[PDB]
Design a protein around this ligand. Sequence first.
Ligand SMILES: OC[C@H]1O[C@@H](O[C@H]2[C@H](O)[C@@H](O)[C@H](O)O[C@@H]2CO)[C@H](O)[C@@H](O)[C@H]1O
Ligand SMILES: OC[C@H]1O[C@@H](O[C@H]2[C@H](O)[C@@H](O)[C@H](O)O[C@@H]2CO)[C@H](O)[C@@H](O)[C@H]1O
Lengths: 134, 134
Amino acid sequence: ASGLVASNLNLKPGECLRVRGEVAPDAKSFVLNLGKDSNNLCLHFNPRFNAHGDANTIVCNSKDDGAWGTEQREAVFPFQPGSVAEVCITFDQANLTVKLPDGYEFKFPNRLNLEAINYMAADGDFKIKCVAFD
Amino acid sequence: ASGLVASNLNLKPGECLRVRGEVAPDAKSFVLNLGKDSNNLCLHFNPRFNAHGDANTIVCNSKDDGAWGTEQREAVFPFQPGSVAEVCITFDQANLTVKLPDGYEFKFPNRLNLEAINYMAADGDFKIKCVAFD
Ligand SMILES: OC[C@H]1O[C@@H](O[C@H]2[C@H](O)[C@@H](O)[C@H](O)O[C@@H]2CO)[C@H](O)[C@@H](O)[C@H]1O
Ligand SMILES: OC[C@H]1O[C@@H](O[C@H]2[C@H](O)[C@@H](O)[C@H](O)O[C@@H]2CO)[C@H](O)[C@@H](O)[C@H]1O
């Protein structure tokens, strides 16, 4: 439908992005991409219910000039098909901090050294209900 | 240095789009555009404080394949520079309904006969802080 795509965000370091959406009742995977543009992502947030060999695994990665970086996987999966889920992402020069629905937080390195986030895109089995920018 | 631009909005008839943003302190006016894309707007929402010869007047218009239609001016002006303002928009095949910060709501004809709104863009005087779909 695909997913909501926002540009010109100009999200600066220290600012938080709140994204709330509905996880499809038959969700297999959904994505929230953040970065400079579609080919340069400081954060590819990919909760995989069942995809690419991952079962209930949050996979994160960066994308530099179209090239996927080294994947990072989390130890929790507070997402359930057919339920609303909210994620809070804070941008910082060194790392991005992600706060999951249940309060679990983890960081992902700002490998691309972005000084601001101007691009956000949603895709997969996640229907965005609201997005808050600072 | 324009404002936030969102695409693939997929807003359907009856769904309520709530947009909250900060009006620049030195804003002479601000704009929130809704439509299919930058050249096809079902709604050019333009509150003018002091711009284009108008004072404290909300000017609305449509843009079809690039052509601006006949403007319609609203009866109220519940806006102020340097403050947070939220507007709620919904639509059907005939009209768009815009609800203002003061609870006042008016209709603007759906001249593009849109059955879905996929594009939204704010200018440099309206910093979007949150967008909700309900
Ligand atoms: O890295 C994010 C990226 O992963 C792709 O899938 C990977 C898979 O995660 C990995 O374990 C395997 O070895 O290679 C696959 C191909 O690169 C996803 O397909 C892509 O959409 C992103 O999610
Ligand atoms: O119609 C939307 C369009 O208006 C342009 O300005 C008009 C102004 O609204 C009208 O009252 C005056 O007579 O002529 C101006 C120029 O044709 C804005 O410049 C444009 O950005 C839109 O807001």
